[PDB]
């Protein structure tokens, strides 16, 4: 159920990224019931697009990804250096609803 | 759309613990609320989920013992009640709900929390 | 329908019956019955009311504005309320609508609280709107089952079918006396007559 391992590590860009991040999965989960938070320095999370259909309430643009069951992709287009945090992936669904690795970003 | 949690706790190795989730902004009387795992320079690890409409929760695999959630309808709480505490638990806890109103809401868990701070020494 | 039972000789706790005088009410009739029969914690039975809030007369049974008939509420720490968390007395609750006076919802379903609809297998959110009642008979005081019966009168315009004046006086005779024997009324002397009448 969890060999989520989300593929990038570590990359340092300044802005003018054209970078994607893939939640890879155990078996294809359902879209829509799918999650991508995105952790900061010494505060909480956040929620940017709640399973890969559409994007959520009101967060910065520019960047919007989807993806399939096994592969469930994102990508960010050229976002400002403050949106330079540790994101994390989720599912739902199947107790226990496991999150991901997480991936990490840099300059 | 506040959340205040309680101040950081500190314990003995292996007696209880609680934590509080005062939740306000939002219809506490149909939602979910969930709980989870954190510490410094480490991953997070989902702990249980809570539908405080109506009594139902699960686990994680390492939380089916020693845990159990706690409903606490009035005063728009949450308790979660931690027995065996062990050293590898100095974590901030969490807390996370839906924005719900009406019946029908928001999928994605956007109201969170801060956590507390517990520390299992001395 | 023997309403004297009820309240001249009865142990029934809280017999507020709004709509009609609990006294008389023998001697008013309306069209039809509707007996009803339910089980309810001991602190939410007051949900009984017209309209108000709580999870009664929203999701539950709800309680038409201006209604006429009477309910009893009585307790019920025995007959059928025993140890460990009955079977039967669950909930209803999560539905989209606060529902509409008199209609019955003998329907279960996957309540629905997101954007999209699980196609029947629980998860997230899709909450199963039924959860038991875990009460036992040594639970506090404002929790124990109390059984209420709500009586149900019609206001329309159709005849009445439950009736039923009673009352009783005895028979004189040989004396100037008012009589009201089935309507009729008059002032005589009242003897014995030998003329047949026929059936």
Redesign the interface.
């Known amino acids: 159920e969890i060999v989520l391992t989300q593929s990038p590590g570590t990359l340092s860009l300044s802005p003018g990224e054209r970078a994607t991040l893939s939640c890879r999965a155990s078996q294809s989960v359902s ?3 799918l ?1 991508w938070y995105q ?1 900061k320095p010494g505060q ?2 956040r ?1 940017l697009i ?2 890969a259909s ?1 994007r ?2 009101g967060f910065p643009d520019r960047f919007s990804g989807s993806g399939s069951g096994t592969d469930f992709t994102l990508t960010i287009s050229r976002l400002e250096p403050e949106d330079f945090a540790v994101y ?1 992936c989720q599912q ?8 991901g ?2 991936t990490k970003v840099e300059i | 759309m506040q959340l205040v949690q309680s101040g950081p706790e500190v314990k003995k190795p292996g007696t209880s613990v609680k934590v509080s989730c005062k939740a306000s902004g939002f219809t506490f009387t149909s939602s979910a609320v ?1 709980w989870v795992r954190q510490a410094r320079g480490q ?4 702990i249980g ?1 809570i539908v405080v409409g109506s009594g139902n929760t ?4 390492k939380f089916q013992e020693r845990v159990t959630i706690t409903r606490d309808m009035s005063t728009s709480t949450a308790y979660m009640e931690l027995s065996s505490l062990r050293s590898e638990d100095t974590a901030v806890y ?1 807390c996370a709900a839906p924005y719900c109103s009406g019946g029908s809401c ?5 109201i ?4 507390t701070m517990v520390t299992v020494s001395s | 329908a023997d309403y004297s039972v009820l309240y001249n000789s009865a142990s029934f706790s809280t017999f507020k019956c709004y709509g009609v005088s609990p006294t008389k009410l023998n001697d008013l009739c309306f069209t039809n019955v509707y007996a009803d029969s339910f089980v309810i914690r001991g602190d939410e039975v007051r949900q009984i009311a017209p309209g108000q809030t709580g999870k009664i007369a929203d999701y539950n049974y709800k309680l038409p504005d201006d209604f006429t008939g009477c309910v009893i509420a009585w307790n019920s720490n025995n007959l059928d309320s025993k140890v460990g968390g009955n079977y039967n007395y669950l909930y209803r609750l999560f539905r989209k609508s606060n529902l509409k006076p008199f209609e019955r919802d003998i329907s279960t379903e996957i309540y629905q609280a ?3 609809p699980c196609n029947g ?1 629980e ?2 959110n899709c909450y199963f709107p039924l959860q038991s009642y875990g009460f036992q008979p040594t639970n506090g005081v404002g929790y124990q089952p109390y059984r209420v019966v709500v009586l149900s009168f019609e206001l329309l315009h159709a005849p009445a079918t439950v009736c039923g004046p009673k009352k009783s006086t005895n028979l004189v005779k040989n004396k100037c006396v008012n009589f009201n024997f089935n309507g009729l009324t008059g002032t005589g002397v009242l003897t014995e007559s030998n003329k047949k009448f026929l059936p």
């Open positions: 879209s829509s019931y999650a952790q909480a999370p929620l709640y399973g559409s959520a309430t994390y739902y669904g199947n107790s226990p609803w496991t999150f690795q997480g | 969930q991953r997070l690890e989902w989920w699960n686990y994680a695999q969490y928001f999928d994605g868990f956007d969170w929390g801060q956590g | 997101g954007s999209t297998v998860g997230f």
